């Protein structure tokens, strides 16, 4: 992962109960979307790409 995504996802996932999963999917979403919403939850309207990304089953993918 890029330095940008590693750094942003570290903060995004700093209060996540399932941290490794959070960091994994935040990283995947950040590489695709070039953004990570602020804070540790919510704020997803800051980046529509991140907000709207779905997994194969059509579920929200990005923490």
């Amino acid at each position: 992962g890029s330095n940008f995504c590693d750094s942003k996802c570290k903060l995004r996932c700093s209060k996540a109960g399932l941290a490794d999963r959070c960091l994994k999917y935040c990283g995947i979403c950040c590489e695709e979307c070039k953004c990570v919403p602020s804070g540790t939850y919510g704020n997803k309207h800051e980046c529509p790409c991140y907000r709207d990304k779905k997994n194969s089953k059509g579920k929200s993918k990005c923490p």
Side-chain angles (χ1 to χ4, degrees), residues 1-9 11-14 16-20 22-33 35-56 58-63:
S2 68
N3 178 269
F4 178 91
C5 290
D6 289 350
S7 173
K8 291 295 198 84
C9 287
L11 191 277
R12 182 66 176 176
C13 294
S14 59
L18 298 174
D20 271 26
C22 182
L23 290 167
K24 172 173 167 186
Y25 286 100
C26 180
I28 291 164
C29 293
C30 177
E31 296 295 340
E32 171 171 349
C33 290
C35 74
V36 178
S38 65
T40 60
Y41 73 102
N43 300 310
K44 293 182 191 183
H45 288 116
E46 290 174 6
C47 184
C49 180
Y50 194 100
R51 176 194 67 203
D52 293 339
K53 191 66 200 177
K54 309 298 190 178
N55 71 10
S56 66
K59 294 185 181 192
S60 288
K61 186 172 185 171
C62 305

